[PDB]
Amino acid sequence: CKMVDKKVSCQVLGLLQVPSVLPPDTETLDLSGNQLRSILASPLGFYTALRHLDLSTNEISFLQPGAFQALTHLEHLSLAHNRLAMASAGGLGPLPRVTSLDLSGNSLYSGLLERLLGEAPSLHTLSLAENSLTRLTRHTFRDMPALEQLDLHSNVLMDIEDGAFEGLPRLTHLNLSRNSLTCISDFSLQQLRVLDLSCNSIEAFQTASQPQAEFQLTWLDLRENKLLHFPDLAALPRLIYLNLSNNLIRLPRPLSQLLNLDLSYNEIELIPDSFLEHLTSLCFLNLSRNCLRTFEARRLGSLPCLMLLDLSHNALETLELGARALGSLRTLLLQGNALRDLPPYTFANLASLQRLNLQGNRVSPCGGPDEPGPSGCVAFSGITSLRSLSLVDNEIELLRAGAFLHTPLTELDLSSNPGLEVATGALGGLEASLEVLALQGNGLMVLQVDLPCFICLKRLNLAENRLSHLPAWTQAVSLEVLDLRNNSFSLLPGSAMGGLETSLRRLYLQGNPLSCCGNGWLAAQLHQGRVD
Amino acid sequence: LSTCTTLDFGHIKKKRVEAIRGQILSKLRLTSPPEPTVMTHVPYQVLALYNSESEYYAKEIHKFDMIKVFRFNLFRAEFRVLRVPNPQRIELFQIQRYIGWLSFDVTDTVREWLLRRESNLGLEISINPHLILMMIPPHRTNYCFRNLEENCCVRPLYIDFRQDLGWKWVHEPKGYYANFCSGPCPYLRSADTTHSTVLGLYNTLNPEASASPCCVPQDLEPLTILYYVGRTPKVEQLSNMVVKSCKCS
Amino acid sequence: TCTTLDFGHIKKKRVEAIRGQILSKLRLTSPPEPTVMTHVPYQVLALYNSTRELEIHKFDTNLFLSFDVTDTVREWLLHLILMMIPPHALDTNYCFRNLEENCCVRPLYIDFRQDLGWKWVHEPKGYYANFCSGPCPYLLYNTLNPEASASPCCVPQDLEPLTILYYVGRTPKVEQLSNMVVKSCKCS
């Protein structure tokens, strides 16, 4: 047994009884992991200076009725993962100075607690997780008015009679996740602040009416349940977080302070007009994996504060966003929908947009301000704030010239658009700012864009395009990664690939038909420190 | 933060009625009810026509091998169930009660052997054998009994044709009770160690280990009705019409 | 029809329900202690492999306490009472060989050591415990009975048992657990 300063450590294994050869001035004492089977008052009472006592993971099953009342200076006591459920006799008595008590993993049951645990004036935290409780009666928690936190997850609770929390006037955290509750009929805990009811079977949720003072609740979690309607939360004016993901909700000031609302994986199909009007302060909103077909924000000044909107994997077909609306939006995710034809100036009215993801739709970009394209194309010509764009798998046949003329974006992605042909000057304007470019899987014969002018380009991806010849670098460009796998490169002259050695870091060729003749530069690179 | 004690079930009753409508039409394979005929009297022939828990728990298995032919101190175990052996018309008797790889599995005729034995006792055949025993070790408003019980149980309801369904063409009977099933079945979350009084809740709240249990009927009964077309009456019986119990499945 | 609910959570909940089902059919508060008894005597395996093997009309074409009189009366037709129809599944084969998105059987395999973490089961090493899933079309209709508390649920029809050989202390135990493998489904 190690000792340092009024503290004793007893190791993982090797004991069957409480030791007695310890100094009598100890103040901490650890015994987890051993093979203890009971706690008798005699050896333990010698240590009247204890303040912390850990007895978890043993096999303790019997506690002498007076064992813990000799210790008058405790503050913490842990008895987790023992076998207390086999204990008529035994139990804990008064515990005046205790402030924490852990009883999780013991397999207790309803009715045993009122005899197991006695008085506790100074308790602040109590943990009863991972037991076999089923019902909370008016008699359960008694004589503990300083309790503040109560952890009851991973039980089997089905009932909560009225008054079970009346003896707790200072509680502020309640945790009832992973239980078996089915219907909630009332809510009257004025002073509570955090409530966690996730992973249950709750079908309906309703709160009280006409309180003396407003409820203080500010954090509510009801994800992964069976709710069928958006709950009525008119009496909770302080709420800041709310999470209703993975339910069955269908849609048909209360929420003037909500800042986070998650509403994914439900069965919503149409959004009433007045619903979005109340949410004045919202900053994040997810509506992914629902069944919407349109989204409207026509009214000017609606959603003033929103910074993220998520609509992926719905079935949208049009977007009626009006100008001077969504003026703060920065991220807009729309992948997996069926958008085809849009008004030309849809995305150019968003004043702060910075990241757009359009993968999997069938959008065809415009052709620059000068000589635009046909009707129904979308204009990416002048979105001054945009910084990232994704157009994977949109079946783009033709990429017109000047498509991104006045958008100083720093990342593009055009992969998996077979039969793509890039008109000359299509990528004009991006030389000064573009950093990443991907064209994998397109299959184009020859690349018309003049790469060596791209000063800032760092990563480039050209895999699975069936190229055979590549333009020539003749300076110290900033490129650092280059991918050419599964192309048709046979010979790599050192003339065209000079100047890249100043900055190149890694590189790939596997899958190409390299020729044994020549290729001295490639051999030199393989000799050098460049990866592969 | 109370739990939930009372729930209204008018919507379930009205949806049940609406479904009974279409169900009876389909059982009678019409796309619309026939318009009522004139009030007619029943003949005498129709009048004469009118006058006229141990499955849940696991079993130990004990095999007792052999020591128109005859088959015959086996009171070691004192278990229940009968044979399933390794190998015209041909059938089997006892020393002469009729009993029937093969199988003759009733949970008896070795209960009697356990109870009383004689000099010879065995099975007959007439115009690697063994036995297999199975028994559970010892340690292992028709159908609900509390007013507005919150469990899965059967609820009462009365169906009468002229009022609810507007069916003038139904003559017998005036109505009947079409009870329904309601109440939730909670999903119980498992653990490796759990108290022995909670191990009895699986048998009734989720016996099938489904991911979402449902409250579904268990016993159902048929309904006989009478109706006229033209001059000829028609006596038709429909099946699966009245509930007698429920179940969580 | 809008039926967006992810398919990995259904698998996770079916497996976690299987755990409690197996533990409570045997009535075990804690899983037994594994032993390295790799040499199981051959006789025990014989028991395991042998268990694993197993209008209305009345009287007293012409028409248009109980016995099975159906054959003779049907032959004659072309005290007794007769019923005559007036002149006017979702099993493994159909679901596994054809694509369906209503109520239907889905496949699942349970390995005791990889899914549940149990090292005390000698035989078998795992089994196929399917499951039922999918929505039901609201009002099949020839056989349906609308009696549940909502739209009909997707519940199993046929179920088959399972044989396990586990080991308690120093003795072997050959069990049989009922209703373990799904084979068909129905809408209520």
Author numbering:
A (entry chain I): 26 to 112, 116 to 280, 312 to 591
B (entry chain B): 1 to 52, 74 to 88, 107 to 111, 122 to 136, 143 to 150, 160 to 164, 176 to 202, 252 to 264, ...
C (entry chain A): 3 to 56, 81 to 86, 121 to 124, 177 to 190, 254 to 263, 278 to 328, 341 to 389
The authors write:
Transforming growth factor-β (TGF-β1) is a multifunctional cytokine with key roles in development, immunity, cancer, and fibrosis. Latency of mature TGF-β is determined by non-covalent association with its N-terminal prodomain cleaved by furin during biosynthesis. The prodomain encircles mature TGF-β homodimer in a ring-shaped disulfide linked homodimer “straitjacket”, (latency-associated peptide, LAP), forming L-TGF-β5. Interestingly, both TGF-β1 and -β3 LAPs contain the integrin binding motif RGDLXXL/I and bind to two integrins, αvβ6 and αvβ8, which together account for the majority of TGF-β1, and some of TGF-β3 function, in vivo.
Single particle cryo-EM studies provided structures of L-TGF-β3/GARP (2.9Å), comparable with that of L-TGF-β1/GARP (3.0Å). The portion of the straitjacket in contact with GARP almost identical in both structures. However, L-TGF-β3 is significantly more flexible in all other regions by B-factor comparison to L-TGF-β1, particularly the arm, which contains the integrin binding site, and the portion of the straitjacket domain, including the lasso loop, that cradles the tip of mature TGF-β containing the receptor binding domain. Such increased intrinsic flexibility suggests that L-TGF-β3 is less constrained and contains higher basal entropy than L-TGF-β1. We hypothesize that increased basal entropy facilitates exposing mature TGF-β3 to TGF-βRs even without binding to αvβ8. To test this, we expressed L-TGF-β3/GARP and measured TGF-β activation using TMLC reporter cells, which, indeed, has significantly higher detectable basal TGF-β activity than that of L-TGF-β1/GARP with no basal activity. A detailed comparison of sequence and structure reveals that the lasso loop of L-TGF-β3 (lasso) is not only shorter than L-TGF-β1 (lasso) but also less conserved in key residues interacting with mature TGF-β53. The high basal activity of L-TGF-β3 was unexpected, which we attribute to the increased intrinsic entropy of straitjacket and lasso loops compared to TGF-β1.
